DNA sequence: CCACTGGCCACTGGAGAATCCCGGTGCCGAGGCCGCTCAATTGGTCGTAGACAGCTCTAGCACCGCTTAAACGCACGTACGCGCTGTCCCCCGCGTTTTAACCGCCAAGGGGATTACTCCCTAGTCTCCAGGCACGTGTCACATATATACATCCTGTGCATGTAAGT
DNA sequence: ACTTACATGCACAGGATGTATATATGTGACACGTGCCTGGAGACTAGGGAGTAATCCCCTTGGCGGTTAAAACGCGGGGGACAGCGCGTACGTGCGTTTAAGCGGTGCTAGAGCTGTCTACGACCAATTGAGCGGCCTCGGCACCGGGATTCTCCAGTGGCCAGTGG
């Protein structure tokens, strides 16, 4: 079980504060490492990672959609 | 609800269909007078033979359909399964002409 | 007083008219004299030749389980051999076809 | 007795026909006047050979050894139609 | 009454009954195999004729006969048909 | 002693100087010349023979010639050829 | 006693050799006879053919500044031709080289 | 800081350079020694004329390098600038080779 | 007197060189070996033509005009060496 | 905080459909016989083409000694394949309407095909001579080298611009 | 919501380099004169392939009715083409080093090539026939048709799984 995938994003994008946003690669990358079973869950990441957009916790830097870049928000 | 195939599933039918059959897949007459407009355009009043016709037609065919496997390697090596006219074009070029 | 004449074929033992390819070489410009032993060697290869393309053929319609030799056999066994279809690589085969070919790429998943 | 336009009666399904024994899956709309225009190119240039050949027999009637001669001419041999 | 045709037909048809006594033939197949052994034999007629002005001959010979089989016909294929008519060489020698 | 070897030095040469009066050549050039006359030649030969093959044609005539002329080269050099041909027919025949 | 011997070729009016063609065509064996006028015919489309290549080449080497001519001009004559080209697309040339030409891809920008 | 250019920048001045080149690219030496070792596998004690192999050298070298540019093309129609081996199969096999 | 890795004679510049020829600007790393084995093969081919041609001139020597005849009787016609 | 609930994804079975496979059935090419004829065969001859030996000479093979040019290799960087995703639109597919292709039937005559005939040209032979070829020689177009001149390519650097922090 | 400081991008100047260009110089390869001989011209002839005329018939062309299967058109939808973003890696480029190619020189000879001989072989020609081709008849393999089995496709139903949300 484990928790949800969405606080494991977050994780994800505050593991590093490059400058810009964190590509999906190396998010994908960063929940390999840390440990997740990322190849049957590619549907729901990529459902997390945008819905987490649209609540406004996170901030798309360059991309739509799942491409480009992510950051956090403001505050 | 109508029934409908989902897309490629038939047309991989005809590629067994027509790869299994040995028929000419033209009509023949359209191509004939194809044969005789051309032909009047070199000089006047030619008469064929029907079989001297059937040889046009389906060496006519065979430059064609290895044309067309040319045109599929050349989709595939650029990842694709739709054809364009680049492909064809390149086709030619490589074939010397 | 003159000896029952037998074939030059016959004298071979082989199928093909040593006399007529002889015949067709002096007429066919190649060379004013011919060897004795050139129709011959002709005439020996070229029956060798249709007896293992023939010999696929036959295969090829018993495979396709029909007892008469059709075109589509023959092109299939002619581009089923890769030396005798690199043989005639630019000869076209009336109604052959094609071998059934799809790529793997254009199947489905 | 002139002709004008046939090269559009080389139809979209036969394309498709030759294509579907050529292989292909999926096919452009822009595919469809370049074939033709490659095809008709061939047969003028094996065309030309053959009335070449037919006026070199003194005949008004083309036949087809004229035929076979100018496909053999550009390296397309045929079988079947020889004899 | 028309002009006789000469053809391959009789000869291929008893090869093919030696190879298969079984089967049957199609008459337009019989003539793709005539135009095949006629194409054929222009070819190699061709080379051979090349040689033997390349070599300043006036007469054709089986070796140079056998250099073009081998020039066209490729490997195992060669030197099968050249074990034929070789042995085929060798006893129309003993007539 | 040598032998003699025979090509084209000369005429090729009367042609390059009445075009080009001020123009040289290299030697391995006139190679290439002779080897392109020589490859010309035995195609429009070779094509020569096989139409009097298909007429059944004992003697080489010149209308075969321009037949074939016009049959392998491609546009107005065929053109250019034949009227070239015709004038070169008409002096001889003159002659 | 006998008149002075004139050459076929000055009948013609042309360079090359119409003797020479005549034995070589005789002795190339196409045929067991040939027609007076068809060397003539051969010799004037080789003149014309000759002509059309020398004068090509020697443009191009007048382009290349150079005196006497070489195979390179020979390959830039060759392939800049489309007509020539497609006579000779099967044809290599001893130390020509190829076109200048890159693909304005391959280029930067 | 030392000079350097960019990578390209050589490779198209050299490519203008071997293109208004017509010399011979690959050392003669391990050509003949090559020549000489796959000419045994067919029969001992060979010898050789010197323009013999010269030759073959340029027959050899203007059949790689007409395989070049038809693998230029197949790796524009690609769309890449990177040739694989793949160009290489496709362009023989277009071929008939 | 025995020739046994002679294939590594085509230096790996050198067919930099020919790509260069080739107008290619960039070639990778897995190309020297196909291109060898190409190069190869064609050339068993030809020098098999070739060979088989002298010992039909009953020669152990080859000839260029030998080569000349390999070379056509594919149709890879080369000029200025006797042809 | 936890359990209820709703959205999303994968598996699966069933329905439909297209094709493979089994018989029947009439049909027309395959094949086999027969009759004719003309081309392979027999036999002999005569000239000659190439095999065979033998001399010659030349070019290729081998060896070596310097002598750089190039191959190799390493290293570092950046440009490129390429993998993923997102998006848009183009074409497979299926139904409906149309139409002309095809069969087949008949009329007609146009030209290929075949035979006869007589003759224009050309292979062949003899004689003779002249033009091309091997060879010697000389000589200037061009290769090579070196010193200027410009092109061009890359990178620092000053100015313009969008955006984060302070007010 | 305004103003100010900072990262970013972009155009230009300059320098380093590589490539063109001008001029001097040898050199050897191109060009030109020479002897010659063999191959091309002159003249005549045999004869024979071939131009031309006549015929016929058969094979091609044109036209007319029916049919239907194939083509054209429309809808639509999904899946494939393609744009972009990032990312890693793998050749591009530059410098040192090895070494191996290459050029020059020398010696060997074995085999390419020319030359005489002669003889086995192959072209040429009269006789003749039987093998092989044109035509005809029959039939059975096979194309077409009809009915059922099978196998492949697809999609709706259902189970699993995750996350939101309200009690």
């Known amino acids: 079980s484990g928790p949800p995938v969405s606080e494991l994003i977050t994780k994800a994008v505050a593991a590093s504060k490059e400058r810009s946003g964190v590509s999906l690669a190396a998010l994908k990358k960063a929940l390999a490492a840390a440990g997740y079973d990322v190849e049957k869950n590619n549907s729901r990441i990529k459902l997390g990672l945008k819905s987490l957009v649209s609540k406004g916790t996170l901030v798309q830097t360059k991309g739509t959609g799942a491409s480009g870049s992510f950051k956090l928000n403001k505050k | 609800k109508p029934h409908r195939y989902r897309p490629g599933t038939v047309a991989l039918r005809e590629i067994r269909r027509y790869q299994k059959s040995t028929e000419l897949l033209i009509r023949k007459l359209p191509f004939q007078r194809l044969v005789r407009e051309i032909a009047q355009d070199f000089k006047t009043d030619l008469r064929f033979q029907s079989s001297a016709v059937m040889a046009l037609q389906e060496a006519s065919e065979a430059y064609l359909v290895g044309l067309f496997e040319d045109t599929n390697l050349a989709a595939i090596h650029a990842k694709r399964v739709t054809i364009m006219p680049k492909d064809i074009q390149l086709a030619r070029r490589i074939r010397g002409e | 007083a003159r000896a029952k004449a037998k074939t030059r074929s016959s004298r071979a033992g082989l199928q093909f008219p040593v006399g007529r390819v002889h015949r067709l070489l002096r007429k066919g410009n190649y060379s004013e004299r011919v060897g004795a032993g050139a129709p011959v060697y002709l005439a020996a290869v070229l029956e060798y030749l249709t007896a293992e393309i023939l010999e696929l053929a036959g295969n090829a319609a018993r495979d396709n389980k029909k007892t008469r030799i059709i075109p589509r056999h023959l092109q299939l066994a002619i581009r089923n051999d890769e030396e005798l279809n690199k043989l005639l690589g630019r000869v076209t085969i009336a109604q052959g076809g094609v071998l059934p070919n799809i790529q793997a790429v254009l199947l489905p998943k | 007795k002139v002709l004008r336009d046939n090269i559009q009666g080389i139809t979209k399904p036969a394309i498709r026909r030759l294509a579907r024994r050529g292989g292909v899956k999926r096919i452009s709309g822009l595919i469809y006047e370049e074939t033709r225009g490659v095809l008709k190119v061939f047969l003028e240039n094996v065309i030309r050979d053959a009335v070449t050949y037919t006026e070199h027999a003194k005949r008004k009637t083309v036949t087809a050894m004229d035929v076979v001669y100018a496909l053999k001419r550009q390296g397309r041999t045929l079988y079947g139609f020889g004899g | ?95």
């Open chain 5, 1 to 95: 009454k028309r002009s006789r045709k000469e053809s391959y037909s009789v000869y291929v048809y008893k090869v093919l009954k030696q190879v298969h006594p079984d089967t049957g033939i199609s008459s337009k197949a019989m003539g793709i195999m005539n135009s095949f052994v006629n194409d054929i034999f222009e070819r190699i007629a061709g080379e051979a004729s090349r040689l033997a002005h390349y070599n300043k001959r006036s007469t054709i010979t089986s070796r140079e006969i056998q250099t073009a089989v081998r020039l066209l016909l490729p490997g195992e294929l060669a030197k099968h048909a050249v074990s034929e008519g070789t042995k085929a060489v060798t006893k129309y020698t003993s007539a």
